[PDB]
Design a protein around this ligand. Structure first.
Ligand SMILES: [Ca+2]
Ligand SMILES: [Ca+2]
Ligand SMILES: [Mg+2]
Ligand SMILES: [Mg+2]
Lengths: 531, 531
């Protein structure tokens, strides 16, 4: 289990929306705990837990009022401990979201910093008004408007790259780094198996607090109107990540399990790849920087050329001897079924789970959940955070309460675990076929050879000496075609259909002739051969 | 062999510059005939002969005044026959440049068409001046200025997409298509093995002769200032090429040798690929459209990401089950050594000859010839067309005459066949190593798997079940590095150095550990793994 992260099958749980175990309409930790067997049953061996920490919920958990406490409606620390134990019982690693860049403005540290408590005054970024009034500089929040908010009591502005309710922590202050590092080991000491480092490339800012220059586009006041050279990718962040990785490896050696780090950065491809490893290859950082290529580029009118080149954009730019990861949805993104269509969730899965490396599934993708736009109450991302759909009972089995924290999608009686489990030809069964296939050594450890077959068909061969070979084929067009896969020189003419998607011109267990493989609209198949 | 074109080792001969056999300073056909053994000796099995037809030389052979006759200084039709016979005796196919779009304005047809001879009047494109005067429409020659030239005798303009000395032939006239097809078979009957179709996508123009729209770039009067929707890629050409291919396939069956077509089009990638095959796969055209990717993109500051994505741009966009071809220079392009540097000619060769399919070598690449800019007398392409460099004698052995049609590059005593053959560490010996390696079944027929190894190293695996595997590795940086090739899952840790370029950190015949392969600046090696 030292190499578990190199071919993990990840599932992102959003704790407010997974399962409510006490009828208040809000998911909770005991609810998750009761479903860790379900996750293992569908082939998951690792979870990404979105932040369950105490939070005023201005950014639903990503604005943390206490980094050591559980949000009360989700449970307490003993509930968290029971979830860690039940995850490990079911063979599932638990990766906790870690929010380094900012705290809630209701955090004790910030309340005390506002009133100039000497213990915490410098925990945040405070600057006087500019000469002649106004913010200290022109920096703009990720969400628009000034990155600075005035506090009348202090007579100063504090920095927030995100909302004003998310004051940035001051990592130029070594006590800030030391405290957040200590908090990391607190959660490790409860059995956690790794961390996702949220918004990591927002950590440091220019020490001279200089104005950023204009981008050359966008209206004044818009985030995109400035070139963010003083507020993103400030390179001191890399040494912090590399140092944390070195502390995780040492902890891993002492405790006998492999602790991993993933980073979330929206950055240049070069700035992203430096989180894996320094340019000179002397330092290691994140095991797996988040890779959003499939969210960006698996689009409704993509062809196989664009799909392949999107995949190669990650792979070509990676450092050698590291692990790629792949993800199609998250708590920050519109659901796959709404983004690309119900008739395309199945081929997205087929691709997701057969690409080399680690696949990441957002809760509800396995029953083809859709955005419920009309449910939005608090946030533009509400539609992709509606309650998990478990059965056809009240509130889709998410809660006994008919009023849930966000409304359940109205079609839940057709798109839920119970109904789909009864249908051998459902997306749910397709998901399970694929995660079961991921256990095959060729999928875990084999080479990958991918090609187009004409510009509309994508094909991905996985091969490992001494093992059967597997060929994923996707039809990126909405019309039937019959194609010749003969450019894969080393495959036999006859192959077996290991997997065929719910609506497919193939059927699992049949043989096909790969010189004349018929693919239905948006088809996906995984073919098998003994070489 | 019916699939010779699928892994041909091509060599482009420029007849004026290859070998002068009679002391007038001009290359001739007898000179070429006497070097076909040299070509077979260095692993060439196919030649592209630049046009030797009668020509006033305003575009040095590409302005043809008699498509059935040889330019007198090059010899006559019996010399041509002797070259064909000696080519075949050495196992070399001869592909003849075919010039369909236009003739010289000294061709008898155009002379007669000017005076409105009814036999030839409609062989060219004649239109009255626009109402109020001026050319029929706004079309602009490829070489700048109007695509129309007035003739007072006719009181009309004739069309030339190239120089005014290259009037466009009128393929809307079936007699023109019949006559040019007749001429193809004339050369086929003399034993030629194929044709390169010059400037093929300029063949047809808008039948309404409508003005072309602006592109949005460039100054008025420049070629790049119009969107060439009426003068380039008019799709009627595809049917002409598909019909020619069908006629070549029939001729191939009757005569018992495989005739190929290659097409030269500067086009969109989509317009280029339609020369292979119709969109619906019902029609075949060129066996190999020219692929200039390596000329465009193997550049002084390229890295492995850019190099791989350039190769993938061709491969991704190809139709399935067709042959790729690769070329690094030509009679229209600055020579590799001047383009990228003398210290990079060797790694260009290594890549060129190990990519799947057919490689094309420009005469003189094998002795690292350089542009002689100061030799320019007639044409911007003169510097890359200087005489072939055979030995250290007068005029590099190209001629007994010190006055050659273009001056010989002044460094010829160091960069010539004779000197380099005596030096087993030379670019010439490296060339022969690679063309000998090309005859291995794995290179002719094996799969290809290519990757970056970090952003500066490109690696290309050729593998074929039951045969040894070969791994090409190129350092795109000008500094030494030691890299780990372990991402190629199925390769052994120990491999043999099959080829090492002249200045390399590896030596042929040594064993390397591919977890730590040291590469010198701009290195290139081919490693072998036994079965
Ligand atoms: Ca910050
Ligand atoms: Ca034309
Ligand atoms: Mg795994
Ligand atoms: Mg060959």
């Amino acid at each position: 289990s030292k190499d578990w992260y190199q071919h993990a099958t990840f599932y992102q749980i959003y704790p407010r929306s997974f399962l409510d175990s006490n009828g208040d309409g809000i998911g909770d930790l005991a609810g998750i705990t009761s479903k860790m067997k379900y996750l293992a049953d569908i082939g998951i061996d690792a979870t990404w837990l979105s932040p369950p920490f105490k939070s005023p919920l201005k950014d639903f958990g990503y604005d943390v009022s206490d980094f050591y406490a559980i949000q009360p409606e989700y449970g307490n620390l003993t509930d968290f401990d029971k979830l860690v134990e039940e995850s490990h019982k079911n063979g599932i690693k638990l990766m906790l979201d870690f929010i380094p860049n900012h705290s809630s403005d209701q955090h004790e540290w910030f309340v005390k910093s506002v009133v100039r408590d000497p213990e915490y005054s410098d925990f945040y970024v405070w600057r006087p008004p500019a000469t002649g009034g106004g913010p200290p500089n022109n920096w703009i929040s990720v969400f628009g408007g000034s990155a600075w908010t005035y506090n009348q009591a202090r007579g100063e502005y504090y920095l927030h790259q995100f909302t004003p309710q998310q004051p940035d922590l001051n990592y130029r202050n070594p006590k800030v780094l030391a405290e957040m590092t200590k908090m990391l080991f607190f959660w490790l000491d409860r059995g956690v198996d790794g961390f996702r480092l949220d918004a990591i490339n927002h950590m440091f800012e220019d020490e001279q607090f200089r104005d950023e220059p204009l981008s050359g586009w966008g209206q004044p006041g818009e985030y995109d109107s400035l070139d963010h050279i003083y507020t993103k990718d400030i390179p001191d962040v890399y040494d912090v990540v590399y140092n944390w990785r070195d502390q995780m490896d040492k902890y891993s050696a002492e405790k006998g399990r492999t602790i991993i780090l993933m980073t979330e950065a929206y950055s240049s491809i070069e700035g992203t790849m430096l989180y894996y490893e320094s340019a000179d290859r002397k330092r290691q950082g994140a095991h797996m920087p988040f890779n959003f290529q499939l969210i960006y580029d698996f689009k409704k009118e993509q062809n196989a050329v664009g799909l392949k080149s999107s995949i190669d954009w990650w792979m070509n730019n990676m450092p050698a001897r590291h692990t790629p990861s792949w993800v199609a949805g998250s708590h920050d993104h519109s659901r796959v079924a709404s983004r690309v269509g119900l008739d395309r969730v199945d081929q997205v899965m087929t691709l997701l789970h057969t690409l080399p490396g680690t696949s990441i599934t957002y809760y509800g993708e396995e029953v083809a959940m859709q955005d419920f736009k009309e449910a939005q109450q608090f946030d533009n991302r509400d539609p992709n955070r509606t309650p998990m759909q478990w059965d056809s009972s009240t509130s889709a089995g998410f809660s006994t309460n008919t009023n849930t924290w966000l409304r359940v999608h109205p079609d839940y009686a057709r798109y839920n675990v119970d109904v789909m489990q009864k249908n051998p030809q459902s997306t749910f069964h397709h998901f399970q076929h694929l995660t079961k296939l991921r256990r095959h050594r060729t999928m875990q450890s084999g080479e990958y050879v991918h090609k187009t077959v004409g510009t509309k068909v994508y094909a991905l061969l996985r091969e490992l000496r001494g093992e059967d070979s597997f060929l994923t084929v996707l039809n990126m067009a909405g019309a039937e075609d019959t194609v010749d896969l003969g450019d894969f020189v080393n495959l036999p003419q006859k192959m077996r259909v290991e997997v065929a998607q719910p609506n497919s011109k193939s059927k699992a267990g049949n043989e096909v002739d790969i010189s004349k493989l018929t693919l239905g609209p948006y088809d996906s198949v995984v073919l098998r051969a003994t070489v």
